[PDB]
Amino acid sequence: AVERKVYPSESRQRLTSYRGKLLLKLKWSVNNGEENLFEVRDCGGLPVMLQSNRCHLNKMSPYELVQHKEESDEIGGYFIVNGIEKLIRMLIVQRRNHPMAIIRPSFANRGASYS
Amino acid sequence: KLIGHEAKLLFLKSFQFILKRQIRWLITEMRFPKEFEHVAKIIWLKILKTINDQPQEELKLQLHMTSTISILYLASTHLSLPVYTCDYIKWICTAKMPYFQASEILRIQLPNYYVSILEGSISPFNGQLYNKIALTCGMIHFKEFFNSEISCQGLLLKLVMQCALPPEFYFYTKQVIEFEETDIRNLTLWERTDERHTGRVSNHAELRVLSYFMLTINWMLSFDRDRQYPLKWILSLTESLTQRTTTSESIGRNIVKVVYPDKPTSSDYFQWSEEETLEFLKWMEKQFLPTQTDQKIARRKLYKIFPLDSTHQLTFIEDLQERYAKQTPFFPPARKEAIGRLLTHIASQLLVDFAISKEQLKDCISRIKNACLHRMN
Amino acid sequence: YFDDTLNKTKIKTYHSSEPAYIEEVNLIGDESNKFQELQTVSIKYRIRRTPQIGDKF
Amino acid sequence: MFEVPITLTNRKFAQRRKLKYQYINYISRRFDRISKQQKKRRRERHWRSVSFEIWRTVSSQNKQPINKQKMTYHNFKKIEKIPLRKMEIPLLHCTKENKLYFQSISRGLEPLKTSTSEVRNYRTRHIVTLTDLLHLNVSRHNWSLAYKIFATLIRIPGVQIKSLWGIGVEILDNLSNSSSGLDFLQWMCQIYSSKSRSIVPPFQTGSRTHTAKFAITYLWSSLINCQKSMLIDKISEWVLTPPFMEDAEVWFIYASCHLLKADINQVIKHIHYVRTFLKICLDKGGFAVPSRLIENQLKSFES
Amino acid sequence: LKYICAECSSKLSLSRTDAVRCKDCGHRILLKARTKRLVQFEAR
Amino acid sequence: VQGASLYCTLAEDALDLHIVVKSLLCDTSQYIQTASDLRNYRDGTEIIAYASGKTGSVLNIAVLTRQNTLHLNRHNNVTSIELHSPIKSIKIPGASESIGRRSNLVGIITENSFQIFRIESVHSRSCDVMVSSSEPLYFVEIDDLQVVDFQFAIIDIKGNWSIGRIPKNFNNQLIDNLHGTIFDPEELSSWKRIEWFSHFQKILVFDRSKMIEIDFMNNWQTEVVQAKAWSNIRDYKRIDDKNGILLTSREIIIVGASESNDPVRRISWKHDLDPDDTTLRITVQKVKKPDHILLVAFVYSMRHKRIYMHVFSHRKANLFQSLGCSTVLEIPGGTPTGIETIFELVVDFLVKLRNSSEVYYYALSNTQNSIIVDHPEWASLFNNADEREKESIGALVSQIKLKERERISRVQNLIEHENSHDEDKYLQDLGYRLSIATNELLESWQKTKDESILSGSLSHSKLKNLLENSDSFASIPEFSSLLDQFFQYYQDQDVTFIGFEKLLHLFLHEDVPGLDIFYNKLLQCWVLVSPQAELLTKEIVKDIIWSLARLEKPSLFEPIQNEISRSLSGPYQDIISSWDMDD
Amino acid sequence: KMQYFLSTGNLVSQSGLDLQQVSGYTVVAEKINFYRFISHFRMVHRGSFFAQLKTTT
Ligand SMILES: [Mg+2]
Ligand SMILES: [Zn+2]
């Protein structure tokens, strides 16, 4: 019975997750192309980031946000999962593609030969 | 606990209460006139006064359900309303008009002698209804007190439309009617007894009407020396009559076929189709809520283990129209066959519809057929 | 609520030692197309805090 | 023209049963003399024994040789002459049709009309048609309709459940929705295994001694719901649960659960386990493979 | 009219075993609504 | 299931059923012990020859006549001209047995009767079947005999049996020396049954109470494991292969048969079938295939023409399984007196129905890749006899036919005048002419008003004795308006009121608001079908509206008078019981 | 499966992903007040691995 939009306030009130359908176009190729089958697969409800290009609040004016029960200046950037607002927190990993010179005790313990 | 030996008073109260209940359903759901009710208080009043002009503590009353239907038909017939017995049979066998119970499952606990006096004799189906209406017509007298002329001509209409006969047969049969009777039709067949053995299979007016109707078709069609009625159109008539189609009516006649005493009509339920069975179970869950009579909740969950659970089919005059058209191509001794099979199918419908016997009907139309040959020869 | 297996009417009671007032009562209906009757409810309590001894400022 | 799933409309059939078994008593009584009431019917019917997996019968051997004619015309009418008048007494109390039935069955003629064929009450005749359409549709693979028939039927207040195999194979072939054949069966056993005659042959039964069909069929069919697998310790957990010791078939079910779980010293314990239950299944009326075959699978395991 | 639809706001009431859903929307989430009744307070 | 997961849940197979192929073959409450018709193939000559499929059919006035004649087979299975014989007894089963192929393809044929037991031989050549009467024995016993089995003539008479032998060809007759009995005083039903088992020279004897094996060339007797607690033995027939046994109980098809050289019971599980009918019988047909050997079980009745079929299979590990049930129907009134058999299934047989001398060949296939009424009760009512009772009927028919002509020509001009000023004058002087007569009858209702004994004022509901005034108009809507303004006119109270529309509801079965729409709907229906459907439909809506045209007793205030006054003469507490408005 | 990750917050792969710990990757965006909320999004740490290490550096 044709689809209707879901806004995050609903997710908050139902205490479930704010999610969109994730579709994969599967290529099933027999004998290197001789005969290949395609099928688009429903791979579940993928939690969506609020105020992103896959959220329904995207591009809404303050007035429209208020009409949709959101904060007037709702920032977004988080996910709603089982009613809880969860943020994947930022990690301070190393530095890409740069050869660091390391002196580390641990390196000496891979063997008596190791410096 | 329960009353002793003067539960006549309670008996007549569950009975009278059940009657007014049925009247409520027929003014309400059948759009009867409010006058009917007064006609019913008068008739039920006359026979109430006659059973309370009777002494004995031995009850000797029979207020079976046939008495309910008996005073309803009696009153309707005084009032000249075009309702006939088959309307009642249909109404009650389809659980619309509440009938087949004492104070249906929901009342009062009475002496089991009277619950038996209610539940017993329940069936109308061998002419018990005609016999009980004539019996009541003796119990209090039809003649001076009421006007016991049947609504004849509407029965003719009902009958032609019930077949697919062209409207000439209304006047045909109306004429044979006038020929033997000159249109005088009574209600009593009473000389209180059981005993009867000649003259009196055929004096319930209706049954004679059906007899004239059958006869008319047979004579009329077998002596159209004009050849007005084709050797074929009798077949096409038989087939448009035979084609089982799903209207409120035929579905009803199936529902009556289920509780008719004799085979074949139950083999007739055999030859029904998935939609007939489906609408049947529908009518079962609707009108067999009018049923009768720890572990209990264990059976509410136990039964609740398995689920209890642009308008398609057409109306009456729609079906009637369409078979009237199915024969609309209107404009040698084996045509007697067509006459016979048509007569026998028509008979079948009458037997289930008017709750009588094969043998009953043919006794009547035999007797009154000789009653026409005798006043013709 | 009424419990069928008990043929009795039972009662979820309030558990905090701190008294409160009822704010919102939400009826959380179910999807999978209607037919289902009420099974889930959210009750929001309001608790007064006139600032007490031991509160930090 | 099919069996009806309703208790048979009553009076005349019961008083005919009276006349029948009462006259039966008088004739067989005088017969043993010459060889020298619901309750009368009750004692009367009483004193009498009441390459593929064929539950074989008891064949012919150890049965006694012969008899040579007992009953000439004169001798039979000797036995018959008196009990027929004793019958003349209560025949005077029964109904004329019933009396005629007594006369005809006692001549040896068999009545034209079935109990159904002469039955008469609205509700019961309607239930007869309902149940009939159930059985017909189930024969016709019309599991949808048949299901509607079954639900509408069990709704009615008169029907206790013989109809369960109807719903077992019904929901089985249905696959459609509702908590399925297994759920129904284990429901049957959970409700009707605790204290909590006419109608009853073996395919519906009471739990004093063997309730057979439905139990063994949910048992095997559930082990086949493990054929879906390769659940087992569940099935043999509730085959472990009941005490109804005259089975052994659940011993072979048990040992089959251990052979299926045996497909490292754990697998050893499962193989010693099945080795045990095959003999404690030689306990009772034997289910036997050559069983050196069972052991040969167990040595393919011992690999 | 004890309840309110959470989506369309239509005021509506229920009964014994009734469709726990809005009779307009078909949304299955309903807010309770509340009725003349005595609650007593001390103005402190 | 049993073998599929004894090996280590649906079926073996998908779902297949029943179809027909029909042909004619030849033409001729308490019931008893009988079944009388056979067809089987043997050849007498055995100078290296073949078998001939023969029929032993039965001819009836009293059932005196036994008839034997040949069948030539084909895809079209017919006969060639008839050969005959009579007996003075009423005749019961024709039986022609055939021992299975341990040995030979067998000789000639036997019958059981009202007194007698006879056995015939036969020779045949060039489309004739000459038989010879191997001699009767009327009885030693004054006892009727239930069943014959078969060279060994075995008889059963109600509760005692005899093994016997037949003479060789000619003209010495049949003797016995080994005998017995299975008498049981407390089984009243007369049928017993003898058919033997394994060809071992050991027999089976039956009554509706039990099944007894008798090893009869030693001394041996056994009652096999059930008895008579919950069901009757209903029939038994040896499913043709020597070591094979097919038994109908009530609600069980039983496949007995040896799986040991000594005689058997099989409790290799079985199927069940659902009645109280005493009249059930059975027969099997046996089809051969590579992977199995399957048997079709026909259980039939004397009550309903339906046939009830189940199928089994013999994968000779002595493996037996069952698939699922199926049932077919059969035609008008009556029921089988004989059913006899001979990736898809073809199974073919003959049936003879209760009281119908016809013998019909039938064939049944798996898929599809390729009333004449003499109902003597009504015909006696329709054909009535004498010639003056033919021309009598015709005379009446002509009377009414010319009458109908009078109706047509009569009303025609009345149809010519519609909405005319003439029909207006007529509807006026009609309406209020009738009003004058109605007032008169209301005055003579005032004089008799104080009757208070009844509440039906005499001979009321009418046009009130002016009858020509009805017909002459012919415009339904202006007539409905006449009646609406007549009801309007007599609104002066104490007068009947009745609303037609709510009653036409009963006529057309939908809401009929107007007296007119009534006429419309009828007119559509009949304009499809008759000339002058407008004339008739108008004449019949006029006739209906008149037949109902109310004018009953003085209204609601008048009945309550007699209501209470009859509620008076009745004694006091029936009067206390009389109760309006219950709940 | 992604929902499970967001819901329970642990790293499940046969790969580490080149990271020194298996949990603590997500956290609730506590809305205790706004100041705390915004802080979450500007927070950075090294990971539970370097937290149990007993140096100050
Ligand atoms: Mg026994
Ligand atoms: Zn809404």
C-beta separation of B164 from B327 below 8 A = yes
Closest ligand (CA of F210) = 1
Please list the helix, strand and coil fractions of chain D in percent, rounded to the nearest 5, in that order: 60, 0, 40
The phi, psi pair for F211, rounded to 5°, reads -125, 120
Q: Phi and psi (nearest 5°) for D5?
A: -95, 50
The b-or-e profile of G14-43 (16+ CB within 10 A means b, else e) is: eeeeeeeeeeebbeebeeeeeeebeebeee
Q: Give B44 Cα–ligand 2 centroid separation in angstroms.
A: 55
After which residues does chain A break, using C–N > 2.5 Å?
Answer: none
Q: Please state, in angstroms and rounded to a whole number, the distance separating the CA atoms of residues B83 and B76.
A: 7
Which technique was used to obtain these atomic coordinates? Answer: cryo-EM
Starting from the edge strand earliest in sequence, which strands make up the sheet with F175-180, in order?
F145-149, F152-157, F160-165, F175-180
C-alpha neighbours within 13 Å on the C-beta side of residue D218: 23
Q: How far is B288 from chain F (nearest CA, A)?
A: 22
Collapsing DSSP to helix, strand or coil, F375 comes out as coil
DSSP assigned state of F31: B
Strands F65-72 and F78-79: antiparallel
Cα gap F56→F111, rounded to integer Å: 10
Q: Can you name the residues that pair with A19 across neighbouring β-strands?
A: A47
Residue E43 belongs to domain with CATH number = 2.20.28.30
Tell whether B299 lies on the interface with C, counting CB pairs under 8 A. no
**Chain C residue closest in CA terms to B304:** C4
In this structure, the number of other CB atoms found within 10 A of the CB of residue F523 comes to 18
In chain G, the residue whose alpha carbon lies closest to the alpha carbon of A81 is: G7
Task: Tell me the C-alpha distance between C53 and B217, whole Å.
Answer: 107
**Residue numbers of F between 116 and 175 with CB closer than 8 Å to D:** 141-143, 158-160
- CA distances to B11, B224, F160 from F144, rounded to whole Å, are 59, 59, 11
Q: Which of F46, F174, F175, F194 is nearest to F106 (CA)?
A: F46
Ligand 2 center–CA C28 separation, angstroms: 13
Q: What is the DSSP letter of F137?
A: E
Residue C12's Cβ-side half-sphere holds a number of Cα atoms within 13 Å equal to: 4
Please say whether the beta carbons of F470 and F542 come within 8 A.
yes
Tell me which residue of F401, F396, F543 sits closest to B152, measured CA to CA: F543
Answer yes or no: are the C-beta atoms of D19 and D87 closer than 8 Å.
yes
Q: Which domain holds residue E18?
A: 2-44
Residue with tokens 């202006």: F478
| Chain D residues with CB-CB distance to F355 below 8 A | none
| In the block, residue with structure tokens 């799903």 | B246
AA letter at F139: F
Task: Consult the annotation and say whether E28 binds a ligand.
Answer: no
Largest Cα separation within chain F, whole Å, is: 113
Assess contact for F311 and F323: CB atoms under 8 A: yes
> How far does residue A82's CA lie from ligand 2's centre (Å)?
23
The CA-based dihedral angle spanning residues F32, F33, F37, F40, taken in that order and rounded to the nearest 10 degrees: 170
Task: Kindly tell me whether chain G and chain F come into contact, counting contact as 3+ Cβ pairs under 8 Å.
Answer: no
- The structure tokens 């479930």 sit at A16
- Tell me how crowded residue A87 is: count the other CB atoms within 10 A of its CB: 19
B20 vs F contacts (CB less than 8 Å): 580-582
Number of helices followed by number of strands (H, E) in chain E = 0, 3
CA distances from C50 to C16, C55, F183 (A): 18, 10, 104
Residue B343 to residues B87, B347, D43, F333, F435, Cα–Cα distance (Å): 22, 6, 55, 18, 45
Do F445 and F451 form a contact (C-beta atoms < 8 A)? no
Q: Which of D68, D116, D135 sits opposite F276 (nearest CB)?
A: D116
Distance between CA atoms of D16 and D98, rounded to whole angstroms? 6
Interchain contact F278–D (C-beta under 8 A): yes
What 3 state SS string does F283-306 have? EEEEEECCCCEEEEEEEECCCCCC
Please indicate whether, in this complex, the C-beta atoms of B281 and D149 are within 8 angstroms of each other: yes
Whether residues B21 and F582 touch (CB distance < 8 A) is answered with yes
Residues sharing a CB contact under 8 Å with residue B215, sequence separation 6 or more, in sequence order = B176, B365, B368, B369, B372
Task: Provide the Cα torsion F564, F568, F573, F575; round to 10°.
Answer: -20
Alpha-carbon distance of B294 to B286, in angstroms, equals 28
Domains held by chain E: number: 1
**Who among A47, A89, A92 is closest to G6 (CB)?**
A47
CB contact under 8 A, B20 and F384: no
Report in angstroms the alpha-carbon separations of F443 from F429, F432, F435, F449. Answer: 21, 16, 12, 9
B353: which residues sit within 8 A by CB, 6+ positions away? B86, B89, B90, B162, B253, B256
Using an 8 Å Cβ cutoff, are B322 and F358 in contact?
Answer: no
Task: State the amino acid at position B213 in one-letter form.
Answer: F
Compare CB distances from B285 to D155, D183, D191 and report the shortest one's residue: D155
Angle at B41 between CA B120 and CA B290, to 5 degrees: 40
User: Cβ distance D173 to D146 under 8 Å?
Assistant: no
The alpha-carbon gap from B151 to the nearest alpha carbon of chain F, in Å, equals 7
**Which amino acid, one-letter code, is at A38?**
F
Give A13's contacts in chain E (Cβ within 8 Å): 6, 29
Name which of B215, B255, B224, B183 is nearest B346 in CA terms. B215
Q: Which residues contact F528 (CB under 8 A, 6 or more apart)?
A: B321, B324, B325, B328
Beta bridge partners of D119: none
How close does chain B come to F60, measured CA to CA in Å? Answer: 28
The set of chains that have 3 or more CB pairs under 8 A with C is A, B, E
Is E33 labelled as part of a ligand binding site?
A: no
Angle between helices F421-447 and F476-489 (to 10 degrees): 30
The chains found to touch F (3+ Cβ pairs under 8 angstroms) are B, D
Q: Best of G1, G2, G34 to disrupt the A interface by mutation (most A CBs within 10 Å)?
A: G2
CA atoms within 13 A on the CB side of F343: 7
Centre a 10 Å sphere on the Cβ of residue A29 and count the other Cβ atoms it contains. Answer: 11
How remote is the CA of residue F281 from the centroid of ligand 1, in Å?
23
SS (H, E, C) chain G: CHHHHHHHCECCCCCCCCCCCCECCEEECCCCCHHHHHHHCCCCECCHHHHCCCCCC
What is the secondary structure of D225-249 as a DSSP string? HHHTT--HHHHHHHTTS----S-SH
Task: Calculate how far, in angstroms, residue E37's C-alpha sits from the geometric centre of ligand 2.
Answer: 27
Where on the phi/psi map is residue D152: left (φ > 0), alpha (ψ -120 to 50), or beta?
alpha
Burial of residue D115 (number of CB atoms within 10 Å: 0-12, 13-18, 19+): middle
SS3 per residue for A17-44: CCEEEEEEEEEEEECCCCEEEEEEEEEE
Written as six digits, the tokens of F320 are 């037996």
Q: Which two tokens stand for residue B227?
A: 């050849």
DSSP state of F247: E
Tokens of F416: 């010519």
* Interaxial angle between packed helices D83-91 and D96-107, expressed in degrees from 0 to 180 and rounded to the nearest 10: 160
Return d(Cα F110, Cα F124) in angstroms, integer: 17
Q: G interface mutation test: which of A86, A92, A93 has the most G CBs within 10 A?
A: A86
**Domain boundaries defined on chain D:** 10-50+72-120, 121-303
Residue B351 to residues A80, B65, B243, F139, Cα–Cα distance (Å):
72, 21, 18, 52
Distance between CA B22 and CA B13 in Å, rounded?
A: 14
Distance CA F410, CA D38 (A): 76
Q: Which two tokens stand for residue F62?
A: 């009293």
Contact, A91 vs G26, CB < 8 A? Answer: no
Closest to D186 in 3D by CA, of D232, D233, D221: D221
Q: How far apart are CA D95 and CA D12, in angstroms?
A: 8
Evaluate whether B45 touches F566 at the Cβ level (below 8 Å).
Answer: yes
Instruction: Count residue pairs from B and D with Cβ separation < 8 A.
Output: 73
Distance (Å, rounded) from C-alpha A113 to C-alpha A107? 10
Cα dihedral B165, B170, B172, B173, rounded to 10, equals: 100
**Beta strands F347-353 and F358-364: pairing type?**
antiparallel
> Is E25 annotated as contributing to ligand binding?
yes
Give per-residue burial for B183-216: e unless 16+ CB within 10 Å, then b: eebebbbeeeeeeeeeeebbbbbbbbbbbbbbbb
Q: Is the dihedral of CA G17, G19, G20, G26 positive or negative?
A: negative
CA dist., res. F245 & res. F204, Å (int): 10
Cβ distance G44 to A84 less than 8 Å, yes or no, reads: no
CA distance C42 to chain B (A): 28
User: Do residues B36 and B75 lie in contact, with contact meaning Cβ atoms separated by under 8 Å?
Assistant: yes
- Per DSSP, the three-state class of F429 is helix
Contact call for C27 and E29, based on CB within 8 A: yes
Q: What is the CA(F209)–ligand 1 centre distance, in A?
A: 10
Whether the Cβ atoms of residue B236 and residue B328 lie closer than 8 Å to each other: no
CB F216 within 8 A of CB F163: yes
Q: Which residues contact D158 (CB under 8 A, 6 or more apart)?
A: D6, D7, D123, D124, D127
For residue F226, the CA-to-ligand 1 centroid distance in Å is 5
The SS3 assignment for D81 reads helix
What tokens appear for D273 in the block?
A: 């386990």
Closest-approaching ligand to the CA atom of F227: 1
Peptide bond into B264 cis (omega under 30): yes
Closest-CA residue to A13 (of C22, E34, E5, C42): C42
d(CA B189, CA D159): 43
Residues of A in contact with E30 (CB under 8 A): none
